[PDB]
Design a protein around this ligand. Structure first.
Ligand SMILES: *[C@@H]1O[C@H](CO)[C@@H](O[C@@H]2O[C@H](CO)[C@@H](O)[C@H](O)[C@H]2NC(C)=O)[C@H](O)[C@H]1NC(C)=O
Ligand SMILES: *[C@@H]1O[C@H](CO)[C@@H](O)[C@H](O)[C@H]1NC(C)=O
Ligand SMILES: *[C@@H]1O[C@H](CO)[C@@H](O)[C@H](O)[C@H]1NC(C)=O
Ligand SMILES: *[C@@H]1O[C@H](CO)[C@@H](O)[C@H](O)[C@H]1NC(C)=O
Lengths: 199, 229
């Protein structure tokens, strides 16, 4: 039956999203698109009248949305405000099947994080604190050691929700190149490397 | 919107505010002394506006209304057939109840009282044209022809400045009067109704007036008062 697929499910700010409809009924009276989980006429974005090959707008129309004869809707410059569920309503004669919905998410591309060090040339059996600093509240924070994921271990601690990595005893096997990386369902960036030479 | 059916309509919608209706200039019905009429005619080219379809435009019927309506015959485009806004009197506007419809077409006043399935956003066009789409509906959709209790055409004075209507109801009977000059009054029709009419509405008149033209639909209405002696 009629499903609906966000292309893409995760859209970066100021990129387009296509609400792709598989697969419309072939003889419809009209079908419309709404903002959110609703068919309230004040949330109507645009609308299409199949027999009249004519489109129409609704209160929620933002000016950057296109409705296609084939059911699909094109957003043009997404804004965080556009993110949510969107409801496709289909009217035959004269029954209407509410019952396409789709949800998509919008995110800001992350910027490069900065990696901070206490001593860059730390002595054996002493604590190091690494701080991943960014302007990305709501980004995920992963730790890297020689390009690969940093191995958790037993004598490492991560606090400030993965913001600060602390390692008390630094045995010689902790020598290398440290980075953090912040992710985000649409972007990944890696911090400047930091090189601990445990001397 | 009072009106429950979601019509499929050839008109845009927006959520704009709308200026408050603009003010004028045994048993007996009259208008009051220094009474002041309000213009309830609304107009668009392209879109209707959702705020059009609620109070104070959707108004209380009470003891009736006295109305005078400009004839826009001469400021309409070439093929046009409706020369002024349609009005709708009724209660809940559903198939459960009688709605009076007074709608001009060409030389006639089409009067009807039926159990209409009225639209959420009922409107009228000066020159209505559907590219052969029976599903389309302007002010109502009824897949079954509704029970009527009056479907009658009356003659309109095609060339005349303004028309004067009186609509009231007593003992369940609705009474309609018409004239084309304020010096006269002529009985239009009257019919007994089982419900009692509590609300009324002048449907937005949408039209593409040609050239630099002041399309000024006006539908001025004051209320009537009852008195028994
Ligand atoms: C319905 O119409 C839309 C818009 O034309 C289609 O979305 C396009 O898919 C085509 C391939 O058929 C690509 O060339 C375009 O890049 C897509 N649209 C864009 C960029 O907005 C959709 O695939 C159509 N077909 C359906 C629903 O089966
Ligand atoms: C909209 O709400 C109903 C509530 O039961 C639910 O079935 C439906 O999945 C919702 N749409 C979503 C989550 O996209
Ligand atoms: C409606 O259709 C026209 C003609 O194809 C197109 O130019 C326009 O962008 C469409 N508008 C909307 C809101 O979808
Ligand atoms: C009223 O006018 C229209 C004009 O086309 C006509 O079709 C209809 O039959 C008329 N109604 C009555 C009751 O004669």
């Amino acid at each position: 039956e009629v499903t609906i697929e966000a292309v893409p499910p995760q859209v970066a700010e100021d990129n387009n999203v296509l609400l792709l409809v598989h697969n419309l009924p072939l003889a419809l009276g009209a079908f419309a698109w709404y903002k959110g989980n609703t068919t309230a006429i004040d949330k109507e974005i645009a609308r299409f009248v199949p027999n009249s090959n004519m489109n129409f707008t609704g209160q929620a129309y933002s000016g950057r949305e296109i409705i296609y004869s084939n059911g699909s809707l094109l957003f043009q410059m997404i804004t965080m405000k556009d993110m949510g569920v969107y409801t496709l309503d289909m009217t035959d004669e004269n029954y209407r099947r509410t019952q396409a919905t789709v949800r998509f998410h919008v995110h800001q591309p992350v910027t490069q994080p900065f990696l901070q060090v206490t001593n860059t040339t730390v002595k054996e059996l002493d604590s190091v604190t690494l701080t991943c600093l960014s302007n990305d509240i709501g980004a995920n924070i992963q730790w890297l050691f020689n390009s690969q994921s940093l191995q958790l271990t037993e004598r490492m601690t991560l606090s400030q929700n993965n913001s600060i990595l602390r390692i008390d005893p630094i045995k010689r096997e902790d020598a290398g190149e440290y980075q953090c990386e912040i992710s985000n369902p649409v972007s990944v960036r890696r911090s400047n490397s930091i090189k601990l030479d445990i001397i | 919107y009072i009106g429950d059916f979601r019509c499929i309509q050839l008109v845009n919608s927006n959520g704009a505010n709308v200026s408050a209706p603009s003010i004028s200039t045994l048993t007996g019905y009259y208008p009051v002394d220094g009474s002041k009429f309000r213009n309830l005619a609304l107009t668009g080219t392209n879109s209707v506006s959702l705020s059009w379809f609620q109070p104070p435009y959707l108004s209380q019927f009470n003891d009736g209304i006295f109305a005078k309506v400009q004839n826009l015959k001469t400021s309409t485009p070439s093929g046009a057939t409706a020369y002024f806004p349609t009005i709708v009197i009724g209660s809940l506007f559903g198939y459960t109840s009688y709605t009076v419809v007074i709608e001009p077409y060409n030389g006639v006043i089409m009067a009807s009282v039926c159990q209409y399935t009225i639209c959420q956003l009922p409107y009228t066009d000066c020159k209505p044209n559907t590219n052969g789409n029976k599903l389309i509906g302007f002010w109502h959709t009824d897949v079954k022809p509704p029970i009527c209790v009056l479907k009658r055409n009356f003659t309109l004075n095609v060339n005349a400045d303004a028309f004067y209507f009186h609509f009231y109801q007593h003992g369940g009977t609705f009474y309609a009067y018409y004239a084309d000059k304020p010096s006269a009054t002529t009985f239009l029709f009257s019919v007994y109704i089982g419900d009692i009419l509590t609300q009324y509405y002048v449907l937005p008149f949408i039209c593409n007036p040609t050239a630099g033209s002041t399309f000024a639909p006006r539908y001025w209405v004051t209320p009537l008062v009852k008195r028994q002696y």
